[PDB]
């Protein structure tokens, strides 16, 4: 499915208008109708970002499907999807507990293999029970079939 568009499609009218407008105001010095790290650098400090010049080039090269440093009306709205949510917000001992009660398909306090297979599908491709079969085995601190908030803590802290 979509990755960035899904995060921008939720933006607020005040965001698209300010973004779509800023670009049309910062591209005035552009040449192909876009703003690369050289032109998008003035749009970030004006909006609400304090990225550096060394990381900037890396930010685009990572989200850019061609790794060039340029960003148009699309690459732009995509530069806020990675700087707002997804791989950025906090994530430590709390992110592990929430993910458990948020993926418990059986919703019974624990999770079995049939449930873990769905949790990875929400964040992984289509694997077979063969690969997800060893994940639940080593993820079980006591090898019982169900995984609670305690055993799950280790299963995610390290396994392969
Ligand atoms: Ca590009
Ligand atoms: Ca369960
Ligand atoms: Ca267990």
Curated annotation (Swiss-Prot):
Q: Which residues form a coiled coil?
A: none
| Positions bound to Ca(2+) 3 | 140, 142, 144, 146, 151
Residues that coordinate or bind Ca(2+) 1:
64, 66, 68, 70, 75
Q: Which Pfam families match?
A: EF-hand_7 (PF13499), EF-hand_8 (PF13833)
One GO term in the molecular function aspect is: calcium ion binding
**GO term, biological process aspect, one:** cardiac muscle contraction
Which residue range or ranges hold the EF-hand domain?
15-50, 51-86, 91-126, 127-160
Q: Any keyword Calcium?
A: yes
Task: Pull one GO CC term from this UniProt entry.
Answer: cardiac Troponin complex
Q: Which CDD domains match?
A: EFh
Q: Keyword Ribonucleoprotein on this protein? A: no
Where do the annotations place Ca(2+) 2 binding? 104, 106, 108, 110, 115
Q: What keywords are annotated for this sequence in UniProt? A: Acetylation, Calcium, Metal-binding, Muscle protein, Repeat
Determine the domain of life of the protein's source: Eukaryota
Add the further remark from the entry.
Answer: Slow skeletal muscle Tn-C can bind 3 calcium ions per molecule. Domain I does not bind calcium.
Q: To which protein family does this belong?
A: Belongs to the troponin C family.
State what this protein does.
Troponin is the central regulatory protein of striated muscle contraction. Tn consists of three components: Tn-I which is the inhibitor of actomyosin ATPase, Tn-T which contains the binding site for tropomyosin and Tn-C. The binding of calcium to Tn-C abolishes the inhibitory action of Tn on actin filaments.
What name has this protein been given in UniProt?
Troponin C, slow skeletal and cardiac muscles
Q: Which organism is it from?
A: Gallus gallus
């Amino acid at each position: 499915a979509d990755i960035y568009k899904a995060a921008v499609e939720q933006l607020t009218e005040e965001q698209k208008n300010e973004f779509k407008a800023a670009f049309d105001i910062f591209v005035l010095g552009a040449e192909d109708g876009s703003i690369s790290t050289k032109e998008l650098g003035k749009v970030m400090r004006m909006l609400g970002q304090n990225p550096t010049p060394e990381e900037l080039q890396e930010m685009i090269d990572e989200v850019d499907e061609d790794g060039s440093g340029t960003v148009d009306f699309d690459e732009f709205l995509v530069m806020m999807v990675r700087s707002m949510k997804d791989d950025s917000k906090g994530k430590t001992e709390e992110e592990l507990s929430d993910l458990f009660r948020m993926f418990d398909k059986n919703a019974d306090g624990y999770i079995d293999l049939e449930e873990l297979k769905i949790m990875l599908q929400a964040t992984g491709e289509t694997i077979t029970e063969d690969d997800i079969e060893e994940l639940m085995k080593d993820g079980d601190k006591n090898n019982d079939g169900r995984i609670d908030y305690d055993e799950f803590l280790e299963f995610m802290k390290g396994v392969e």
